Amino acid sequence: PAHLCFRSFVEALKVDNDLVEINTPIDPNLEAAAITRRVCETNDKAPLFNNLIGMKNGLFRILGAPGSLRKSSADRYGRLARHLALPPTASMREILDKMLSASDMPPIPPTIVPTGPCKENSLDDSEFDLTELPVPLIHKSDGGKYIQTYGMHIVQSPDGTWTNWSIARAMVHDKNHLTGLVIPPQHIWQIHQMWKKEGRSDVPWALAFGVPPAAIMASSMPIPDGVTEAGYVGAMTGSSLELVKCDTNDLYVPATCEIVLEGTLSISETGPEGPFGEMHGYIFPGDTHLGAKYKVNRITYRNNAIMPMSSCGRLTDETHTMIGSLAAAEIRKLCQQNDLPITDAFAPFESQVTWVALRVDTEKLRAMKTTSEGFRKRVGDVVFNHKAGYTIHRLVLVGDDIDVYEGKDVLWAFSTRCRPGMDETLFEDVRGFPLIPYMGHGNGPAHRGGKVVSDALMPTEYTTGRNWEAADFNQSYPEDLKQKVLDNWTKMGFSNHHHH
C-alpha cells in the first residue's frame, strides 16, 4: 500500500502518470536538484533519477519533488493524497482533516517485526564513506551536500516514554558524520536537551529515508509534545506500523525504509552547518554556523534504494505544501481547543507560508460580544505562544465568506478588510522563526518578535452580521440571471474543462 511503503508510493506516482523516470546518467552535483527545482516551479511530474553518477553498491537513486504540486487543479494535491490513501482529487481540507483525525483517537502503537526490506543490505564503520555516496548538492551556494531533506530523524526521550519522528535538514560533514539544524522549539531539540541535562551519553539516533509516506507527513507536522508519531500515524491510517530494530542500537525504524542511518546525535560536539537554500526562497552564501553533529555507525538499505529529496526554495515544494499546511492544521485544532471559533486554517503559498489565514464562525463570534482588539490579542496569545505557531509570523482573521484555501480570496480580504495598524496587533515578546530573512538577516532580534495578527473581519461581523454583498458575478446578480448568462455563454461567442 502506497501510504505504508515508499516503494509502492513511487509505483503509485508512475501509474498516475505523475512520474518521469530518468534512466540516463544525472549528476547529483546540482543537476538532479536543478531538474527538481524546475519541476517544483512548474508543477511538473516528480523526477525519478534511476541513474545517478557515482551511485556505488545500490546507493542510491533519487526521487525529487515527492510532495510537490501537480499542474491540474483537479488533482493539484494528488501527490500529498498519495501519502495518505486519499483519492488524488482530495481537497486541502480533506488532507488536513486526515492529518488531524488521529488527535482524538487512541494511538495505535507500532508492531515489531524481525526483519524487512530496509535490512536487505548493510555497511558498517569500515565499509561506507558518506563523502563517496552520490549525495546531492542541492543549491550552488550550499555549504554542504544535503543528504537529509526528506528523511525522518528518530530520537527517544531518556525515559523511553516518547519517540519522536521529525524532518530536520542535515548535511555530510565527513566520511561518518553529518551536521544539521537542531533548534528550539522543535521536538528533536527538546529531546536533545533532555539528554544533555542527563549528561551521561550521546543521543541514540537513526535517520530513515524513504519511510512510509504517511509517516513522513506526520514527521512534518507539529503534533503535540510527548506524542510518539508512530502511534499517531497508526491511528490515522487505522493500522499498526511495522518497525524493525536497528542493528547497532535499540531504536525502531519502519520495516520498508529505503535507507537507514544508525548512530548518535552528540550532546557535546558541533560542526559547520549551512548555509542552505531554504523554504522562504533564499540562501545567504558564506553564512555558516555551528550546528548539531551526528555520528553514523551503520547504513542499512533496500536493494535499489531510492533517496527522496526536496529541492526547496521558491514556490512550490515540500517546505510549502507540508510545513505550512500541516502547521496550519495544528493551529486550527489548537484554536478550537482554546474555545476560539475557527473553522479552517491555511498558510497561503503567496505568503511564502509565513501567514496563516483563520476562517471564523462569525455566528459564534457574535455570541462572544467582543471586539477586534480583544479577539486579536487572544488569538495571537494562543497561537504565537505555542510551538504550532513557530513558523507563522502573520495571522489573518477572515469571516465565513472567505475560502482560506484560496490565496486570491485571502489576499482580497486582507487588502480590503484590515486597516493597517489599527486593525492589527504586533507581538514582539514571542519566539520568532529565524529562517525568515527579515528575522535572521533583518533589522531586529533573530529569535524574538516580528509577529502580527491582522484582523480582516469587518466591524458588523462582531455585532449584527456581514452588511455587504460582493461586487462579483456570484453575489451581485440574482440566480436566474446568472444561470441564463452561463447557459448562453458560448452561444453568445465567449470562451468556455475541470480535469485538463
Ligand X SMILES: Cc1cc2c3c(c1C)C(C)(C)CC=[N+]3c1c([nH]c(=O)[nH]c1=O)N2C[C@H](O)[C@H](O)[C@H](O)COP(=O)(O)O
Binding residues for ligand X restricted to 306-325, rule: CB under 6 A: 310, 312, 318-319, 322-323
Select from K ion, a second copy, ligand X, none the partner in contact with residue 186, using the beta carbon and a kind-dependent cut-off of 5 to 8 Å.
ligand X
Select from a second copy, K ion, Mn ion, none the partner in contact with residue 361, using the beta carbon and a kind-dependent cut-off of 5 to 8 Å.
none
Helix (H) or strand (E) holding 293: strand 289-301
Select from Mn ion, ligand X, K ion, none the partner in contact with residue 75, using the beta carbon and a kind-dependent cut-off of 5 to 8 Å.
none
Mask: binding to a second copy, 418-437, rule CB under 8 A, as x and -?
xxxxxxx-x-x-------xx
**Does 222 sit near ligand X (CB under 6 A)?**
yes
Q: What residue is closest to K ion based on CB?
A: 423
Paired sense of beta strands 355-360 and 394-398, if any = parallel
Binders of a second copy among residues 359 to 418 (CB under 8 A) are 372, 393-394, 408, 411-412, 415-418
Please tell me the distance from the alpha carbon of residue 159 to that of residue 430, in angstroms, as a whole number: 30
**Does 425 sit near K ion (CB under 5 A)?**
no
Please tell me the distance from the alpha carbon of residue 261 to that of residue 178, in angstroms, as a whole number: 11
Binders of Mn ion among residues 182 to 241 (CB under 5 A) are 187
**What is the side-by-side strand order in the sheet with 46-49?**
19-22, 46-49, 61-64, 306-309
Contact window for ligand X (CB under 6 A) among 104-112, 166-174, 351-359, 467-475: 166-174
* Binding test (CB under 8 A) with a second copy, winner from 282, 301, 384, 433: 282
Binders of K ion among residues 153 to 212 (CB under 5 A) are 166
- Write the CB contacts of 120 (distance below 8 Å, at least 6 apart in sequence): 301, 302, 303
Please tell me the distance from the alpha carbon of residue 409 to that of residue 468, in angstroms, as a whole number: 16
Mask: binding to ligand X, 133-152, rule CB under 6 A, as x and -?
----------------xx--
Binders of a second copy among residues 193 to 252 (CB under 8 A) are none
- Residue spans of alpha helices (H) in 43-129: 78-81, 92-101
Instruction: Identify which of residues 32 and 236 has a Cβ nearer to K ion in the complex.
Output: 236
* Binding test (CB under 6 A) with ligand X, winner from 220, 266, 325, 454: 220
**Does 461 sit near a second copy (CB under 8 A)?**
no
Q: How many residues bind ligand X (CB under 6 A)?
A: 21
- Write the CB contacts of 381 (distance below 8 Å, at least 6 apart in sequence): none
Q: How many residues bind a second copy (CB under 8 A)?
A: 89
* Binding test (CB under 5 A) with Mn ion, winner from 156, 164, 351, 354: 164
* Binding test (CB under 8 A) with a second copy, winner from 149, 164, 352, 362: 352
- Nearest approach, Cβ of 214 to K ion (angstroms)? 12
**Does 157 sit near ligand X (CB under 6 A)?**
no
CB atoms within 10 A of CB 42: 12
164 is in an annotated binding site: yes
Question: Active site includes 278?
Answer: yes
- Nearest approach, Cβ of 321 to ligand X (angstroms)? 8
CB-CB contact of 312 with 278 (8 Å): yes
Sign of CA dihedral 26, 29, 31, 37: positive
Please tell me the distance from the alpha carbon of residue 153 to that of residue 184, in angstroms, as a whole number: 15
Select from Mn ion, ligand X, K ion, none the partner in contact with residue 183, using the beta carbon and a kind-dependent cut-off of 5 to 8 Å.
ligand X
Please tell me the distance from the alpha carbon of residue 485 to that of residue 494, in angstroms, as a whole number: 11
337 is in an annotated binding site: no
CA distances to 19, 91, 110 from 449, in Å: 42, 33, 39
Please tell me the distance from the alpha carbon of residue 238 to that of residue 250, in angstroms, as a whole number: 26
**Residue 448: exposure state from Cβ atoms within 10 A (0-12, 13-18, ≥19):** middle
Q: How many residues bind K ion (CB under 5 A)?
A: 4
CA distances to 104, 310, 399 from 34, in Å: 41, 11, 41
Binders of ligand X among residues 178 to 197 (CB under 6 A) are 181, 183, 186-188
Listing DSSP states for 431-444 in one string gives B--TTSHHHHTSSS
Instruction: Identify which of residues 234 and 380 has a Cβ nearer to a second copy in the complex.
Output: 380
73 is in an annotated binding site: no
Catalytic residue among 278, 318, 330, 424: 278
* Binding test (CB under 6 A) with ligand X, winner from 37, 45, 169, 386: 169
Helix (H) or strand (E) holding 307: strand 306-309
Listing DSSP states for 353-364 in one string gives T-EEEEEE-HHH
Residues that bind ligand X (CB under 6 A): 149-150, 164, 166-169, 181, 183, 186-188, 220-222, 310, 312, 318-319, 322-323
Residues serving a catalytic function are: 278
**Binding-site annotation: residue ranges for Mn(2+):** 164, 187, 229
**Binding-site annotation: residue ranges for prenylated FMN:** 164-169, 186-187, 229, 387
